[PDB]
């Protein structure tokens, strides 16, 4: 374009759009200017002042990280001049700071510790008394060692752009200017672990990490998050084959670098209640630990005796794709096709046969250009913590319009609150609600429908109401024509694989024709009790957790997690991603579609495929989007489904839209794993006992 | 802090002790299951505590460059006293 | 002089690897991601190969991590992607390839952060 | 390119030579070893070993592979001909400490995580 | 030591102990970590 | 001299450890203190260097003046936490003397 | 010589002298020499064409102006990245002047290297030991075989794809009476570290962006 | 129950390819009608990039049939899934 102009760096041009700063300028060439205060995905604040460098016949120095360039400037990122006002300046942020460093989580992964060894001294000249701080509780999952701050403000920063929680800030003036809350009140959000990561320093650090490892010991397995379907790019910290800790991992269409506190701190919930052994019930009517050979031949014992309708699977919301076709290949050969999941999404008009009915079409990336949302009976700050942060920040940028429709629950940023009954949809339709005109208007809007409210009876008339007011906003030559409105936004990591497999989303088809035989594969949410089932029904429960489905099994066939396997999962907006293995399942558990493969070699029904390899072939032919891995599709043919989805007219209930995760309370514990965990527990009962109830030593 | 789990075998300052069934514990029948016996936990409980009268107090451990590196810590807090990280000594601050 | 040679380059016999641990193993193609612990970038610069992890157990004597893994701690650098996946075909191991994930470059102003009318104005510093 | 330079053949035909001269050294050598390395096993199991090595490289057609692996193979022979090696050196060729491992799925299921 | 007395701790022995290798007294190592994975317990309850 | 263990679990002798012979986890203890939960020495891979007392912070791992430990079997050199804390208490009265002796040099 | 105490003072004497000769070295032998630097502390490189190792080293062996009549050393590099993965480098010493050269050339797994024993018959353990830990073959050597590694080993240990520990062991069986491999099992996994750093430490050494 | 009852149909498609243009017409025009000619019969369209274009039908007992669909015409399309039925 003609917008770029050129500086030099160094006396190498490089040419950059108007409004770049000068550190912005030197990373084109290369080179990373130190830092401490400035985050690329924060507000510039300028302070830490270790930015500054040196630009040629200037005679004073500039902080890089808020100085837009000038053209025909040259950067002098290594004069000498350039390098003594960093000596200064780290001179100066380790003046009070403590000596900790052996006793500090951050010791060995420091910006402080090795920005100090690249651009500062050697030796000190501080020949005084250093300043020490008392240190404040801000809530059972950060620990606070504040005279380890050294003042760069990011924290504060982040919690009010990202998190929009204001509880943050500076009180108190010069040398004595103090990061905190002021008052006894405990940082917590969704998002509230996210200030470890970005806090430079031994200031802020992971509780549930605190003194367990170093950083140079543990390997890095990159895998991706279960805790929900914003399918999170995460990392797994091991050492000596023990999970350590969960890191974020950056990917700028998905959760940039951020993660929730559930992805977090949940790990500690693989530790507990693990299902190790196969077991079997004896003569008694107890669980008994049992070998492979005698459990899987009780289990392939009854499957031969069934047929058809008698065999019926249910899948978890953490199962993945290689367990969901191979449990399926195996109920096919016994003439079932009752493959349940215990999510419900509407069968009615078109359903799952095409993806577009059931995916989050306008992508993620994509709420960065919507300028109007529409939010129907969800709660997004709950059920996709990382997807909300993504409405906050163009909320925040952009100036996105955002309205609701369901309870008034608290999003973090203001938005207008159409009501709560499902009546309203009816009327934007028609052009009565006022509303109606700033979607026609809108030149890319965006409606969000979230499957909490799907899961009510009504369910598959809001899907087609809702459906049929993205359908007028397309038709009107208002929207760009390639731009996608409707959306459903889902919270259980294994539901849009499995309806790309083609399993019947709920339990109503187990209700409908009760079975003899019934697999749980992972299936703890409670829907299909023995009250629902014939008298001697054959319960097999596949889990890697004992909680809900595991007591009321017949045969449990212990199976993995997903920090032990190289599964597939599909998240909400339709991407595919797979996990790769961090640690091996404990004890005897085995990889969940090894389970069902063997189940069908002691059954006779062999499947035709033992590697890893053959049985992610197979899941090409059933579906080929399954294997391109960190690649969004897209779904076509809205105009089809919308026509089917009229075909049936159904009644709005008259119950109000209530989306079932309200308070914060409600979002730590709402899986097998995360219900193990006793961070989730200790964070429960933070938020709902009291702040000050939760207090422990923090010496060091 | 020596006490014995029900099966007879001390437990450690670090809470270790073969359970009921676990066979490794044969390796001790007819030799000793090695247990130092000062437990450090319950040493620096007993350590009194060391009123001063200013706002930050430093320790080093003692003996100067024979201790551990020289900490600075906070005495504002009346609720609780102030604990080395290095030493575990406590201070507090007198009559305020 | 020379001769002309047109078969895909394979010396997986004569390196000396067990057939085990050609066949079975599944490398990786990537580059690590940064430690958001830090700022620093200059580990993610080169492109490295890495196998699947295999099973680690409790020593029954001391506690320590045993393995029958010989790969478990094999890393190589290369400088480009091509070079990862050259290595890895002439070698014979079955590899899949991560594409690098570059940061987008952003927009920055401080002057955004006293804004009179938009809601990028900060209410504190 | 393609153009690369050669060790010993250059082409199939003159490597095949080799490889076929090779394997009547080592068949003529089995009786030998079997003798000198005072070996329990029969020299027919010897010869059966010597053949077993030579088809796990059938496939290779690249010239300079075969040569290679000729090279390897004659390194080795001069080993067991000199009696550099020893008696525990040429009964490594047969395993016979390792415990039967399957290769079925349920076998490899039933004992541990591996492919 | 007599002239020059060691700096009493009382931690310290007091019993010096001489090499107790091959004697009923010998050191034997074992583990000092506590169990890493807790197992499910299956319920008590028998109710099908 | 109180009597609490001056090791705090940082990991530098682990880290320096030439022949990889130690072996730490370390723990928040019951009072909250940075503590090693598993210190061990396989005395059969270490080489003796010194390098580990060299970048100890705390003065908490030291090489003794004992060179008459020979033993019988191999279990007998793979040192737990009890086993290098009864060793402190043991020939503590002599250590801290060449300590004493040798600080100023370091 | 500067009194800065802790810098390793420059020589530009030496650095003249040695950036003279590579220029000699190559107006000499065109035909072969493809680079030639001289580093900060005064070491000449001369890199050639794998075809013209005995050319080049015959003509510093015996050039009256070259005389670099010792083989110091003999050894090979493995860089898995470059495609000629194996750079093979010589370390010759000048008596008569004083003087040491370095002459580094390259090749794969495939492609053999002349044997310079003809030129310096100190090559011919250096030359089996290249052979032995890296897999690279010399022609027309006189006797090339294992010298380091034991009889029967497979494979070459200093590749950079060889694993640590190996992946066989050895230990005495009872029941065969005799030293026996097997696949190697470590009752403690060699422990890796990531101890890199993230933040550039040399900028002089800074590559320019893809 | 009963035998070779078709149990299920599955298109796979590209989006933006030359020889798949016939099977997008097909589901633009015909799809609605076929799916409520056979209201419990899972049709199954999967769209990828680069894919060449398919169709997949699932018999009884997990039988499974593949045909081809590239460079089809709507009507050649239209034949296929009329063939598939009722057999
Ligand atoms: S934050 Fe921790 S690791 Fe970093 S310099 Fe301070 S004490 Fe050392
Ligand atoms: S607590 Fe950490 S992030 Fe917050 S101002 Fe202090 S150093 Fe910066
Ligand atoms: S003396 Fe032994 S334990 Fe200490 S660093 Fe050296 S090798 Fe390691
Ligand atoms: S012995 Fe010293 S260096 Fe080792 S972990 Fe303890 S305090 Fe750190
Ligand atoms: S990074 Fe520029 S002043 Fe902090
Ligand atoms: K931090
Ligand atoms: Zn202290």
Redesign the interface.
């Not at chain 1, 693989?270 to 052994?277: A, D, I, N």
């Not at chain 2, 007819?30 to 090695?34: D, Y």
């Not at chain 6, 008459?68 to 079997?73: P, Q, V």
């Given at each position: 374009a003609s917008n770029l102009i050129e500086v030099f760096v160094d006396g190498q041009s490089v040419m950059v759009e108007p409004g770049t700063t000068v550190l912005q300028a030197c990373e084109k060439v290369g080179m990373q200017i130190p830092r401490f205060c400035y985050h690329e995905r924060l507000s510039v604040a300028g302070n830490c002042r270790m930015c500054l460098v040196e630009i040629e016949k200037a005679p004073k120095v500039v902080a890089a990280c808020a100085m837009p360039v000038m053209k025909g400037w040259n950067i002098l990122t290594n004069s000498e001049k350039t390098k003594k006002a960093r000596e200064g300046v780290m001179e100066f942020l380790l003046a009070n700071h403590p000596l900790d460093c052996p006793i500090c989580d951050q010791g060995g992964e420091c910006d402080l510790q090795d920005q100090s060894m690249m651009f500062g001294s050697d030796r000190s000249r501080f020949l005084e008394g250093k300043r020490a701080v008392e240190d404040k509780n801000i809530g059972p999952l950060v620990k606070t060692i504040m005279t380890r701050c050294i003042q760069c403000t990011r924290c504060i920063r982040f919690a009010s752009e990202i998190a929009g929680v204001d509880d943050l800030g500076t009180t108190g003036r010069g040398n004595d200017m103090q990061v905190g809350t002021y008052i006894e009140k405990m940082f917590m959000s969704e998002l509230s672990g996210n200030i470890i990561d970005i806090c430079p320093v031994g200031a802020l650090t992971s509780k549930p990490y605190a003194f367990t490892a170093r950083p140079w010991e543990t390997r890095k397995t990159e895998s991706i998050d279960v805790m929900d379907a914003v399918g999170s790019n995460i990392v797994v910290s091991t050492r000596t084959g023990?999970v350590m800790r969960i890191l974020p991992r950056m990917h700028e269409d998905i959760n940039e670098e951020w993660i929730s506190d559930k992805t977090r701190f949940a790990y500690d919930g693989?530790?507990?209640?693990?299902?190790?052994?196969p077991?079997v019930?004896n003569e008694?009517?107890?669980?008994?630990h049992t070998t492979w050979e005698d459990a899987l031949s009780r289990v392939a014992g009854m499957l031969q005796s069934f047929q058809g309708n008698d065999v019926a699977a249910i899948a978890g919301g953490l199962v993945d794709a290689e367990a969901l076709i191979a449990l399926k290949d195996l109920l096919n050969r016994v003439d079932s096709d009752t493959l349940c999941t215990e999510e419900v999404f509407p069968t009615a008009g078109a359903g799952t046969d095409l993806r577009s009915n059931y995916l989050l079409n306008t992508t993620i990336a994509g709420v960065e250009e919507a300028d109007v949302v529409l939010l129907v009976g969800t709660n997004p700050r709950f059920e996709a913590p990382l997807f909300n942060a993504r409405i906050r920040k163009s909320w925040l940028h952009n100036d996105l319009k955002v309205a609701l429709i369901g309870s008034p629950v608290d999003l973090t940023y203001r938005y207008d609150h159409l009501g709560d009954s499902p009546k309203i949809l009816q009327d934007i339709a028609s052009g009565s609600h006022p509303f109606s005109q700033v979607l026609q208007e809108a030149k890319k809007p965006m409606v969000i429908l979230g499957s909490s409210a799907l899961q009510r009876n009504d369910g598959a008339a809001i899907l087609a109401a809702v459906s049929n007011i993205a359908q007028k906003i397309r038709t009107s030559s208002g929207v760009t024509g390639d731009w996608k409105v409707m959306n459903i936004l889902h919270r259980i990591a294994s539901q849009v694989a499995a309806l790309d497999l083609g399993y019947k989303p709920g339990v109503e088809a187990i209700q409908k024709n009760p079975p003899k035989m019934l697999f749980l594969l992972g299936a703890d949410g409670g829907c299909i009790t023995?009250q629902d089932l014939p008298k001697?029904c054959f319960i097999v429960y596949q889990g890697h957790?004992?909680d809900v489905g595991?007591?009321?099994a017949?045969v449990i066939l212990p199976g993995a997690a997903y920090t032990e396997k190289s599964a597939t999962y599909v998240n909400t907006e339709g991407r595919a991603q797979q996990t790769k293995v961090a640690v091996t399942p404990?004890?005897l558990a085995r990889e969940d579609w090894k389970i069902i493969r063997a189940l069908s070699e002691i059954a006779g029904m062999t499947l035709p495929y033992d590697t890893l390899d053959q049985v992610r072939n197979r899941l090409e032919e059933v579906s080929p989007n399954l294997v391109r891995y960190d690649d969004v599709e897209g779904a076509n043919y809205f105009q089809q489904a919308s026509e089917l989805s009229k075909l049936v007219n159904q009644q709005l209930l008259a119950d109000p839209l209530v989306p079932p995760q309200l308070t914060i309370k409600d979002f730590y514990m709402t899986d097998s794993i995360s219900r193990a965990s006793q961070t989730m527990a200790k964070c429960v009962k933070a938020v709902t006992e009291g702040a000050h109830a939760v207090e422990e030593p923090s010496i060091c | 802090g020596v006490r014995t789990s029900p099966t007879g075998e001390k437990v450690?300052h670090?809470?270790?002790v073969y359970d009921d069934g676990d066979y490794?514990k044969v390796?001790?029948v007819?030799?000793?299951?090695?247990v130092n016996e000062?437990f450090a936990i319950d040493?620096i409980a007993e350590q009194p505590v060391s009123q001063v009268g200013s706002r930050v107090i430093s320790c080093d451990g003692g003996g100067g460059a024979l201790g551990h590196p020289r900490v600075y810590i906070n005495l504002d807090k009346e609720t609780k006293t102030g604990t080395c990280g290095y030493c575990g000594l406590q201070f507090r601050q007198q009559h305020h | 002089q020379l001769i002309t040679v047109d078969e895909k380059l394979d010396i997986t016999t004569i390196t000396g690897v067990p057939e085990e641990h050609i066949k079975t193993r599944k490398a990786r193609i990537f580059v690590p991601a940064r430690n958001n612990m830090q700022s620093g970038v200059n580990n993610t610069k080169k492109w490295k190969m890495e196998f699947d992890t295999r099973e680690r157990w409790?020593n029954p004597?001391?506690?320590w991590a045993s393995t029958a893994d010989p790969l478990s701690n094999l890393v190589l650098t290369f400088s480009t992607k091509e070079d990862a996946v050259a290595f890895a075909e002439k070698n014979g191991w079955s590899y899949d390839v991560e594409e690098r994930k570059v940061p987008k470059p952003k927009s920055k102003s401080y002057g955004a952060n006293f804004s009179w009318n938009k809601r990028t104005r900060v209410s504190t510093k | 390119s393609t153009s690369v330079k050669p060790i010993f053949s250059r082409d199939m035909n003159e490597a095949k030579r080799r490889v076929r001269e090779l394997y009547r050294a080592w068949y003529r050598e089995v009786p030998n070893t079997v003798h000198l390395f005072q070996l329990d096993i029969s020299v027919k199991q010897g010869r059966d070993k010597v053949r077993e090595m030579f088809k796990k490289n059938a496939h290779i057609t690249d010239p300079r592979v075969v040569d290679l692996l000729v090279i390897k193979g004659k390194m080795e022979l001069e080993e067991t001909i000199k009696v550099w090696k020893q008696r525990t050196h040429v009964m490594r060729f047969f395993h016979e400490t390792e415990a039967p491992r399957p290769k079925d799925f349920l076998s490899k299921f039933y004992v541990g995580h591996d492919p | 030591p007599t002239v020059k007395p060691?700096?009493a701790?009382?931690?310290?022995?007091t019993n010096?102990?001489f090499?107790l290798?091959?004697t009923?007294?010998?050191?034997?190592?074992?583990?000092?970590?506590?169990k890493?994975?807790?197992?499910?317990?299956?319920?008590?309850?028998?109710?099908? | 001299?109180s009597?609490e263990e001056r090791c705090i679990a940082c990991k530098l002798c682990e880290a320096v450890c030439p022949a990889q012979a130690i072996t730490i986890?370390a723990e928040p203890r019951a009072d909250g203190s940075r503590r090693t939960?598993?210190y061990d020495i396989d005395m059969t891979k270490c080489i003796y260097c010194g390098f580990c007392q060299e970048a100890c912070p705390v003065d908490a791992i030291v090489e003794g003046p004992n060179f008459?430990?020979?033993?019988?079997?191999h279990?007998?050199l793979?040192?737990?936490?009890?086993?290098l804390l009864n060793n402190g208490?043991?020939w503590?009265?002599?250590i801290?003397?060449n300590i004493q002796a040798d600080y100023l040099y370091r | 010589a500067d009194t800065r105490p802790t810098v390793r003072p420059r020589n530009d004497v030496a650095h003249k002298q040695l950036s003279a000769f590579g220029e000699y070295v190559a107006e000499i032998l065109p035909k072969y020499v493809q680079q030639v630097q001289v580093s900060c502390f005064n070491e000449l490189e001369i890199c050639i064409h794998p075809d013209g190792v005995i050319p080049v080293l015959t003509f510093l062996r015996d050039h009256s102006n070259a005389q670099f009549k010792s083989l110091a050393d003999l050894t090979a590099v493995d860089i898995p990245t470059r495609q000629n993965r194996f750079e093979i480098v010589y370390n010759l010493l000048s008596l008569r002047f004083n003087s040491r050269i370095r002459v580094k050339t390259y090749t794969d797994e495939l492609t053999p290297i002349e044997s310079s024993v003809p030129v310096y018959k100190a090559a011919n353990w250096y030359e089996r030991e290249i052979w032995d830990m890296f897999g690279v073959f010399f022609a027309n050597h006189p006797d090339l075989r294992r010298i380091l590694t034991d009889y029967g080993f497979e494979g070459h240990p200093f590749r950079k794809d060889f694993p640590l520990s190996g992946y066989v062991e050895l230990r005495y069986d009872d029941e065969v009476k005799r030293v026996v491999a097997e696949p190697v099992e470590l009752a403690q996994e060699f422990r890796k570290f990531d101890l890199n750093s993230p933040w550039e430490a040399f900028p002089a050494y800074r590559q320019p962006p893809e | 129950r009963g035998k070779l009852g078709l149990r299920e149909i599955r298109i796979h498609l590209c989006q933006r390819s030359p020889g798949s243009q016939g099977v997008r017409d097909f589901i633009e025009k015909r799809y609605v009608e076929l799916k409520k000619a056979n209201p419990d019969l899972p049709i199954l369209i999967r769209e990828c990039s680069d894919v060449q274009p398919k169709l997949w039908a699932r018999y009884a007992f997990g039988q499974e049939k593949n045909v081809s669909l590239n460079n089809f015409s709507a009507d050649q399309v239209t034949r296929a899934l009329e063939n598939v039925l009722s057999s």
């Open positions: 023990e693989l530790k507990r209640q693990r299902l190790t052994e077991m019930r008694k009517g107890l669980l008994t023995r001697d957790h004992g595991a007591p009321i017949d404990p004890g | 450690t670090t809470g270790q490794r390796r001790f007819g030799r000793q299951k090695e000062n040493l | 409790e004597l001391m506690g | - | 060691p700096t701790r009382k931690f310290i022995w010096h102990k090499n290798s091959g009923p007294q010998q050191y034997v190592p074992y583990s000092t970590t506590r890493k994975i807790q197992e499910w317990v299956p319920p008590s309850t028998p109710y099908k | 001299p009597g986890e939960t598993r008459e430990f020979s033993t019988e079997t279990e007998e793979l040192y737990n936490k009890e086993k208490d043991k503590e009265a002599e801290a003397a | - | -």
